[PDB]
């Protein structure tokens, strides 16, 4: 089977069937330049059966611009042979070999997918014809400076099993009309979300039982809440119930051969503001081969006018269709160079296409993809003398941007937050770019350690690097790849608690920040820091095949916090408590039960055992908190303490009985199963599923699994040695006596009594230890207990059970991730970083990125300008602020604002604190008025001011002279 411990994140994106299909596919990769290297790396991380690296060119100085696996000592050797040794270490399950012979017809028959890079026109045509004639998938990829070209030909009949990769959506039916155009209405006016022309199946339908398990039927969406399935008069009348589930219909398409698709190309639009670009780029790429043939196999010289004119003439002679002459000239001017982020992005795209060819999942490119990043070039262009090679490893980059931009890159300082997959790819791209190799630096921080599941998508880490810090290992790896890179690594988590290191002086010398985090709080904190220090910030985020990039420029664009994302979906309280109807509800309930039983029930006992004077601290707590703590401690230490593993088994059996018999019986007693409302709908109808108490059976694998997991976890909590024998557990659990259950329709003295009970009866020699929920370990029985609990609750309410895979996905809050999306998004982010470093300020040059490699889809948009507001006729944005210097009292602060800005402050706040307000008590207001602002902040925040703090940020709500509220920028208060 598939090794889930390594491909855990990738499985949620691909699937078991897709991964099985890729495990039987052989890949041949021709050309081992930078683009070929990225393609091979991403494919190997994908986990194909085998990959063969074929190349005829030899390593040169120009290849070091993008190939991170070649060094100066590798000059003169074959690129494929030199890179094969390092490429094999990425994945031990993939057999990697190197080939140097000619690509004969018999040799090509051994590969399912063939990738061609840097191949000439005749070889490309011959191999494409052979592959199409013999049913072999072919992909042709090229990169010329700031341009890209991808071609896909997957055969005469290619079958796709999942066209979009989205999970099926199921809805619940309330009523179905019985006529020739039967209309399905969803429950209590809830949107089904079904697309027009979708195929659905029906289950759990009463009355129209013929529709149960029927073949998928084409639907017609008549509205947001209704749709038609056709003639339903041939079936019986509809009583109630029913669940309609979307079904993914496979699609079969035909790919034209290259020799035909050249004349009639279908373009996948890469940028919707450049609809005419692909038509010109097709002709330019086609005529590049003719120009090479006409000039002794030499590409046009960098930024040479004569060569550009010659290439334009060649393009004019080659094709009769009108083309953008300026675009052709630019392409000819920068065709001889090569850059790393473009290679990474195109490599990610091509690797995703290879995976699509292997597994048959997702819709491939149909058929050509052309992309460009001309906005990275300076507006005035690059002088030809500036683009001449200087015998350096960045020669292919100087051929595009010039030596001056290389000098600017060498002196740049950039901060990368998070060293995950996106962080590692950003670090690799920055190192390959030469950023910080001069007087600059690259800072990277991460608080996490390397885990085995991280190796699937993070190529900077090795199996022997587990338990090591991510940041230091990544820094060492990229130092090995490029010795000139200067990197400073930290093991800190960005936030208010680490401002000692990431102080204002640290951000003062920075030129930008790149975000590679996985949570919103860190993103907001980094946004606040970047706004306060006025430095550009680049935001990247991925989710499976989805990805996005947002660029923030000071004084130009809005911030990441200016817009809002959908909130996290919570579960209604009753749905979690008494009336679950989906497996997610039962999984959340199981997680809550696990936490409450194995963690929250033992924290107080552990604290009491560890701290001898815990009782005297908890005796001073206000309210009924001391009683709530002492009673829990007593219950955990005396009443429910098991003295043997048999007691643990008995406790597990009793807990099972209460959770799946007693509470359900009580719920049914409160609400009878056949309860009927006056108008006709039953109470246990629609979203409400009538439960039924279970009957304990030791022969049932689910019951035995739950008992085993619960008993083992309970023994682990109390320090009793675990008994990992299923037969022993089954034997022990059969002797437990279950008491009968029936449904049902001075404080100081108490605390003293309980304290006496703990000091007399309770023993401090116990080993109470709360359990921390860990999901990536298969030997801690956490996932087994969670699965057993959720499946038992599902069987309680006749909810279909979910296997361990879906339970781990949902309960563990796993974010699916793949390497190709990470590579593409990191390449785009590095392109935006290059744009920022160039010196661009017009929002037209910058482009926010959005991508979905499944469709495939990728579009760009200009970042929105910062919102403008006016007070007293003065325009201000989120980047503007007031400047208050020196040390002033609170009264002096208010008087300063009133006298200068003519604003009466009615509410002054510092972060979450509240220094001043109109409704504050008069005594506190009088006390705080003469004190200095620093002292007031220290008193209100209940924390000392650190020496590294040179300034404070205040938010004020002010009233104008006429008495109406006005929005004003925040205040920067400079400490003396």
């Amino acid at each position: 089977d598939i090794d889930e411990s390594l491909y855990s994140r990738q499985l949620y994106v691909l699937g078991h069937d897709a991964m099985r299909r890729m495990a039987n596919s052989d890949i041949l990769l021709s050309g081992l330049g930078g683009l070929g290297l990225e393609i091979a790396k991403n494919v190997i991380l994908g986990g194909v059966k085998s990959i063969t690296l074929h190349d005829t060119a030899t390593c040169g100085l120009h290849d070091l611009s993008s190939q991170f696996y070649l060094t100066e000592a590798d000059i003169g050797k074959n690129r494929a042979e030199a890179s094969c040794a390092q490429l094999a270490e990425l994945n031990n399950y993939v057999r990697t070999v190197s080939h140097t012979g000619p690509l004969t017809e018999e040799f090509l028959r051994k590969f399912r997918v063939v990738v061609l890079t840097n191949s000439d026109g005749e070889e490309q045509q011959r191999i494409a014809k052979f592959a199409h004639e013999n049913g072999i998938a072919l992909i042709i990829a090229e990169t010329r400076g700031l341009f890209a070209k991808v071609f896909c030909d997957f055969g005469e009949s290619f079958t796709i099993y999942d066209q979009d990769g989205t999970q099926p959506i199921s809805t619940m039916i309330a009523s179905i009309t019985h006529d020739a155009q039967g209309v399905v209405t969803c429950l209590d006016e809830t949107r089904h979300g079904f697309n027009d022309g979708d195929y659905v199946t029906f289950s759990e339908v009463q009355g129209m039982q013929e529709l149960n398990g029927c073949q998928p039927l084409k639907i017609t969406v008549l509205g947001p809440y209704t749709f038609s399935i056709g003639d339903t008069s041939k079936f019986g009348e509809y009583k109630s119930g029913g669940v309609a589930t979307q079904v993914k219909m496979p699609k079969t398409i035909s790919f034209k051969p290259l020799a035909q698709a050249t004349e009639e190309p279908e373009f996948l639009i890469s940028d919707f503001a450049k609809l005419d670009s692909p038509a010109t780029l097709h002709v330019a790429f086609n005529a590049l081969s003719c120009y090479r043939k006409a000039h002794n196999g030499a590409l046009p010289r960098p930024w040479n006018e004569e060569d550009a004119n010659s290439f334009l003439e060649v393009v004019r002679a080659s094709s009769n269709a009108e083309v953008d002459e300026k675009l052709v000239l630019q392409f000819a001017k920068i065709c001889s160079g090569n850059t790393c982020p473009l290679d990474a992005a195109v490599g990610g795209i091509v690797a995703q296409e290879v995976l699509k060819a292997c597994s048959g999942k997702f819709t491939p490119i149909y058929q050509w993809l052309y992309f460009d990043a001309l906005e990275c070039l300076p507006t005035e262009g690059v002088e030809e003398a500036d683009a001449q090679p200087v015998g350096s490893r960045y020669d292919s980059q100087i051929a595009i941007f010039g030596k001056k931009f290389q000098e600017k890159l060498a002196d740049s300082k950039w901060f990368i937050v998070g060293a995950g997959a996106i962080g590692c790819e950003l670090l690799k791209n920055f190192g390959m770019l030469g950023l910080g190799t001069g007087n600059g630096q690259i800072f990277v921080t991460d608080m996490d350690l390397i885990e085995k599941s991280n190796l699937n998508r993070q190529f900077l880490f090795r199996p022997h690097d587990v338990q090591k810090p991510k940041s230091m290992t990544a820094a060492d790896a990229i130092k090995r790849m490029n010795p000139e890179v200067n990197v400073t690594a930290y093991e800190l988590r960005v936030g208010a608690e680490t401002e000692k290191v990431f102080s204002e002086d640290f951000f003062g010398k920075l030129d930008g920040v790149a975000n590679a985090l996985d949570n919103v709080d860190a993103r907001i904190y980094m946004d606040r820091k970047c706004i306060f220090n006025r430095i550009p910030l680049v935001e990247t985020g991925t989710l499976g095949t989805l990805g996005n990039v947002q660029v923030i420029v000071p004084f130009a664009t809005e911030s990441y916090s200016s817009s809002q994302d959908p909130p996290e979906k919570s579960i209604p309280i009753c749905t979690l408590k008494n009336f679950p109807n989906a497996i997610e509800h039962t999984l959340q309930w199981a997680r809550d039960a696990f936490e409450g039983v194995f963690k929250q029930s033992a924290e107080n006992a552990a604290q009491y055992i560890a701290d001898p004077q815990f009782t005297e601290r908890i005796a001073k707590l206000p309210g009924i908190q001391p009683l709530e703590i002492l009673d829990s401690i007593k219950k955990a230490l005396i009443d429910d303490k098991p003295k043997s593993f048999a007691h643990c088994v008995e406790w597990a059996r009793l807990y099972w009985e209460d959770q799946y018999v007693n509470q359900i019986k009580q719920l049914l007693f409160n609400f009878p199963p056949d309860q009927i409302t006056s108008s006709g709908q039953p109470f246990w109808s629609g979203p409400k599923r009538c439960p039924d108490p279970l009957v304990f059976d030791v022969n049932d694998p689910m019951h035995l699994d739950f008992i085993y997991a619960a008993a083992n976890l309970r023994a682990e909590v109390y320090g009793i040695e675990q008994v990992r024998n299923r037969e022993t557990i089954a034997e022990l659990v059969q002797k437990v006596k279950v008491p009968e259950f029936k449904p049902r329709s001075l404080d100081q003295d108490r605390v003293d009594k309980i304290i006496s009970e703990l000091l007399k009866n309770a023993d401090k020699s116990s080993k109470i230890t709360p359990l921390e929920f860990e999901k990536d370990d298969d030997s801690n029985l956490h996932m087994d207990f969670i699965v057993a609990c959720s499946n038992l609750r599902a069987a309680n309410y006749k909810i279909p059970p979910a296997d361990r895979h879906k339970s781990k996905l949902i309960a563990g809050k796993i974010i699916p991730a793949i390497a190709t999306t990470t590579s593409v998004l990191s390449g785009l982010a590095v392109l935006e970083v290059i744009k920022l470093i160039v010196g661009h300020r017009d929002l037209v040059k910058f482009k926010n990125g959005f991508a979905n490699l499944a469709l495939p889809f990728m579009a760009f948009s200009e970042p929105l300008p910062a919102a403008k507001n006016t007070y007293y006729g003065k325009e201000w944005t989120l980047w503007d602020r007031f400047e208050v210097t020196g040390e002033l009292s609170l009264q002096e602060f208010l008087n300063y604002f009133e006298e200068n800005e003519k604003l009466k402050i009615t509410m002054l706040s510092q972060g979450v604190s509240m220094l001043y307000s109109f409704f504050m008590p008069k005594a506190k207001c009088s006390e705080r008025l003469p004190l200095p602002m620093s002292e007031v902040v220290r008193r209100v925040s209940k924390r000392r001011l650190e020496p590294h703090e040179r300034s404070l940020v205040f938010e004020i709500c002010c009233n104008d002279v006429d008495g109406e509220d006005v929005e004003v920028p925040y205040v920067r208060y400079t400490l003396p």
Binding site: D164, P224, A273, G420, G423, V520, T540, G541, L543, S861
Partner: protein, 76 residues
């Protein structure tokens, strides 16, 4: 005039809108048909992000044009 809105997840939306209507109206129609609140919608057309207070005529949205409903992600 009839326009199409394509979500980043690949689902297609059909709207009945005459030009001159404020984006706010377009976002309200999209909310009625799917359910996302207006402030959580990001409409992209021809490399531009549609902002409130404008009409379709300024963005030259004509018949049978396609919009894109993109969203930000929290992974990494």
């Amino acid at each position: 005039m009839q326009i199409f809105v394509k979500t980043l997840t690949g689902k297609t939306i059909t709207l009945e809108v005459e030009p001159s209507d404020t984006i706010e109206n377009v976002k309200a129609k999209i909310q009625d048909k799917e359910g996302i609140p207006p402030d959580q919608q990001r409409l992209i057309f021809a490399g531009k992000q549609l902002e409130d207070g404008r009409t379709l005529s300024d963005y030259n949205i004509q018949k049978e044009s396609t919009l894109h409903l993109v969203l930000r992600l929290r992974g990494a």
